[PDB]
Amino acid sequence: IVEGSDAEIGMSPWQVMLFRKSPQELLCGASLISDRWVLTAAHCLLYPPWDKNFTENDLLVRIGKHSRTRYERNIEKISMLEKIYIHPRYNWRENLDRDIALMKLKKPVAFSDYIHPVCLPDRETAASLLQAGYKGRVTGWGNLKEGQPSVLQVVNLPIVERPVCKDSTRIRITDNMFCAGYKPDEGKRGDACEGDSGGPFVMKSPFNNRWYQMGIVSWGEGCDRDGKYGFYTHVFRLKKWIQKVIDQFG
Amino acid sequence: DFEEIPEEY
Amino acid sequence: EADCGLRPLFEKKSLEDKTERELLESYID
């Protein structure tokens, strides 16, 4: 996260770190949506251009974390993966369209003050909150500039008008994406960066005061560049796929 | 860079 | 879960984090 700040303890209890077994390293961000399911970006697990194609046994899920590098004894819980599910129409060849994947855990994780699932939006929540100007929140242990942070970083960013998102890049933007971030003329800044991929873009509903994950950190050209914005997978648009996988394999 | 994690995982 | 999105150390105890108000203030419509 670029230009964000340290997260408060228990501020993002659904935050998940995707951890590579060997070499031991941070692979991506992710989120807890139930005691057995974790949501992330498909490119965190499959991206042929960079010869990335992880299988279940290559990684681990660390939940309830705050510190990036430390083993948080008595706080974080480490889970193994039972199965990975990538959207069948995830477009890694062109523009990361449908950048979403699910991971089922071998055993249920116990909730605590530091571990708690985030909600997934229904049609009305998405229609009501996914509006230009409305701010969401992005969290991650990714790079601070285009070294690494000591603890989870957080930044609030405004959703941007679709025409503006499109005119900021040469990449083909789809309805399964939305972008967020400040304009150069707005002064404030902030953006997700390398390592933040797969992390959640959340919003707190003013209707029922619950947090909903509206997006997944997907891509950006550089980090926090003026005139550029961060792009996120539109979670509601792909919820039918999410429900299908969980109904069938859950 | 990362502190080792218990071998059990 | 019927308890999704309610944080143990925040919503559950009726405590607000340092910047959530920024989000609420942006939901002007």
Ligand SMILES: Nc1nc2ccc(NC(=O)[C@@H]3CCCN3C(=O)[C@@H](CC3CCCCC3)NS(=O)(=O)Cc3ccccc3)cc2s1
């Ligand atoms: N707001 C954000 N910025 C970034 C920049 C690095 C990482 N990027 C990533 O994890 C993903 C992995 C695949 C390469 N990648 C990316 O986001 C691609 C840009 C993609 C390519 C395919 C079609 C959509 C655009 N790489 S990325 O920006 O380093 C490429 C780059 C473009 C212009 C100038 C300098 C570097 C996350 C974020 S999130």
Ligand code: NA
């Ligand atoms: Na992240």
Ligand code: NA
């Ligand atoms: Na209400």
